[PDB]
Write a protein that binds this ligand. Structure first.
Ligand SMILES: N[C@@H]1[C@@H](O)[C@H](O[C@@H]2O[C@H](CO)[C@@H](O[C@@H]3O[C@H](CO)[C@@H](O[C@@H]4O[C@H](CO)[C@@H](O[C@@H]5O[C@H](CO)[C@@H](O)[C@H](O)[C@H]5N)[C@H](O)[C@H]4N)[C@H](O)[C@H]3N)[C@H](O)[C@H]2N)[C@@H](CO)O[C@H]1O
Ligand SMILES: *[C@@H]1O[C@H](CO)[C@@H](O)[C@H](O)[C@H]1NC(C)=O
Ligand SMILES: *[C@@H]1O[C@H](CO)[C@@H](O)[C@H](O)[C@H]1NC(C)=O
Length: 383
């Protein structure tokens, strides 16, 4: 009764060579809930924005995805609205008034019917965030949107789910999330327990540490998966609504010139923007799990791999390049910890970055760990 929630990226199909990952590559039976990412919202009319219509509509991407339910009827196929690239200002604007929320709600309902989705995942990043076009009143108005969506979904009578992807930093919670009320209205809270460290922070570190490290201070002190999930609990979310995100990717850095200290917390060349882009994701500071294992785990690798003994994550470096990520050891630690805490399950950003080709070993190695642990686990009553 645990969830394995798999975000699926519609842009992964454009990655070259063995990076290409399409609907047909999703290992459906390893997931309980699969979320097509992303649709957005229009700036002017508060309607659903289809972001890649040639793929999503003309080549039937949405429908190919939802019709996977024919062969896998026990799995739920939903769509996520928002995402980082969408920005937050259009969402803050959409929720500002009852009339614009109801326009979006009607548009969402038509869209879910049209493409036979099982519901919607809200991924506005983030209500209340001044750095993302948000403002103080988003906290109330995001909750109104959620309540209004739930009521529309009820009226539609198809039992659609409504979930949200959420951050775990206290200040973000305070600025954007009425926790008890959101947790009551939503079927699952997909906690983004990753991107907790990265080039933006000005030092090298793993991005999904499970527990506090000695160098963690001030805003970073509780910015780890264990304390962040504990914060959601403390703020009133039941244990059996919280799903813990696991990144199938690393945050990388270019170290500062002449820097021979590779320890956690070491200074970086921040203007580099992150580690050099890898060949398939081609994004500074960001490497898919399969881009990491093909470099770090080969027999003749010149990478040095280390282990964060407190955060329970691997990191690896070579020359000026340094990357923190998740590997089978760290993911297994997190699966055991999820079961120890009694949370609703595990989530991944994103299924298209697992080693789905078996370039390094067994295919789909990371999602198989989520599936192995969660499928044998019974979620206990709320704590
Ligand atoms: N919820 C949080 C997530 O949002 C977050 O992960 C991020 O999500 C965002 C979306 O919100 C991702 O943004 C997408 O990034 C894509 C890849 O960079 C962009 O697509 C590409 O854009 C390129 C420019 O046009 C194109 O590059 C070309 O490639 C060609 C192949 O045809 C090549 O021939 C050519 O020479 C190139 N021009 C490419 O075609 C195209 N697909 C997309 O626009 C963009 N919006 C972001 O990547 C992702 N990291 C997550 C992690 O932070 O946390 C989440 O949970
Ligand atoms: C949808 O499936 C059809 C039939 O296999 C295929 O031709 C098309 O490429 C698929 N579209 C996408 C976006 O995966
Ligand atoms: C990789 O992204 C870089 C930097 O954005 C861009 O200049 C280039 O066109 C991309 N290369 C490929 C192969 O997509």
């Amino acid at each position: 009764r645990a969830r394995v929630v798999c975000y699926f990226s519609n842009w992964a199909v454009y990655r070259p060579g063995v990076g290409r990952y399409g609907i047909e590559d999703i290992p459906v039976d390893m997931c309980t809930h699969i979320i097509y990412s992303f649709i957005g919202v229009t700036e002017d009319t508060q309607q659903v924005l289809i972001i890649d219509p040639e793929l999503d509509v003309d080549k039937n991407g949405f429908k190919n995805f939802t019709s996977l339910r024919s062969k896998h009827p026990g799995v739920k196929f939903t769509v996520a609205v928002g995402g980082w690239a969408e920005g937050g200002s259009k969402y803050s604007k959409m929720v500002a008034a009852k009339s614009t929320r109801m326009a979006f709600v009607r548009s969402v309902v038509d869209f879910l019917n049209k493409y036979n989705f099982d519901g919607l995942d809200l991924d506005w990043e983030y209500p209340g965030a001044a750095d993302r076009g948000g403002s103080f009143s988003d906290k109330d108005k995001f909750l109104y949107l959620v309540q209004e969506l739930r009521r529309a979904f009820i009226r539609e009578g198809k039992g659609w789910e409504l979930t949200a992807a959420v951050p775990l930093a206290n200040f973000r919670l305070m600025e954007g999330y009425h926790v008890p009320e959101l947790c009551q209205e939503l079927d699952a809270i997909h906690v983004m327990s990753y991107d907790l460290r990265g080039n933006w922070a000005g030092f090298a570190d793993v991005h999904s540490p499970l527990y506090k490290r000695p160098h963690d201070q001030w805003a970073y002190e509780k910015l780890n998966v264990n304390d962040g999930l504990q914060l959601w609990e403390d703020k009133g979310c039941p244990t059996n609504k919280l799903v813990v995100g696991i990144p199938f990717y690393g945050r990388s850095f270019t170290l500062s010139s002449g820097n021979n200290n590779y320890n956690l917390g070491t200074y970086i060349n921040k203007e580099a923007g992150g580690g050099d882009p890898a060949p398939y994701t081609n994004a500074t500071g960001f490497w898919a799990y399969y881009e990491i294992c093909t470099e770090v785990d080969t027999a003749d690798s010149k990478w040095t791999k280390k282990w964060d003994e407190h955060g329970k994550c691997p990191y690896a470096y070579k020359g000026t390049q340094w990357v923190g990520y998740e590997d089978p050891r760290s993911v297994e630690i997190k699966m055991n910890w999820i079961k120890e805490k009694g949370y609703l399950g595990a989530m991944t950003w994103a299924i298209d970055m697992d080693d789905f080709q078996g370039l390094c070993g067994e295919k789909n190695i990371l999602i198989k760990l989520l599936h192995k642990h969660m499928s044998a686990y019974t979620v206990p009553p709320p704590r």
